[PDB]
Design a protein around this ligand. Structure first.
Ligand SMILES: *C(=O)C[C@@H]1O[C@@H](C)[C@@H](O)[C@@H](O)[C@@H]1O
Ligand SMILES: [Ca+2]
Ligand SMILES: [Ca+2]
Ligand SMILES: [Ca+2]
Length: 114
């Protein structure tokens, strides 16, 4: 199934943060309405924040996270969880190799902000 695609409420500010846990340099692309809105790049094996940003979901609300290592797309796992009908997390994991720990780039999207 498709992973890393989320429908946010339109015209809403949201946070996106990426962590790295891999010897491979992680490239995280955040697409809003099918157009690239942010790009994070970095290497860490100790969960370092490789990028954090505030974005707007625009009129479509469609947010897509893509992860590539060595120009090859990582395998993604994702879900969205809502707490007290109000607090939203869109969660992405990714695997760039064979050990299947799926933490190589971890991406957290959260809203609302402010
Ligand atoms: C490369 O060795 C594979 C890669 O990096 C490792 C340090 C480990 O984090 C593994 O999960 C990742 O796929
Ligand atoms: Ca891995
Ligand atoms: Ca890893
Ligand atoms: Ca608040």
């Amino acid at each position: 199934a498709t992973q890393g695609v989320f429908t946010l409420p339109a015209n809403t500010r949201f946070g996106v943060t990426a962590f790295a846990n891999s010897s491979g340099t992680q490239t995280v692309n955040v697409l809003v309405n099918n157009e690239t809105a942010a790009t994070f790049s970095g290497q860490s094996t100790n969960n370092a924040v490789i990028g954090t940003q505030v974005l707007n979901s625009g009129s479509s609300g469609k947010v897509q996270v893509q992860v590539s290592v060595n120009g090859r797309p990582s395998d993604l796992v994702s879900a969205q969880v809502i707490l007290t009908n109000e607090l939203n997390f869109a969660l992405v994991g990714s695997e760039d190799g064979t050990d299947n720990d799926y933490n190589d780039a971890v991406v957290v999207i959260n809203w609302p902000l402010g």
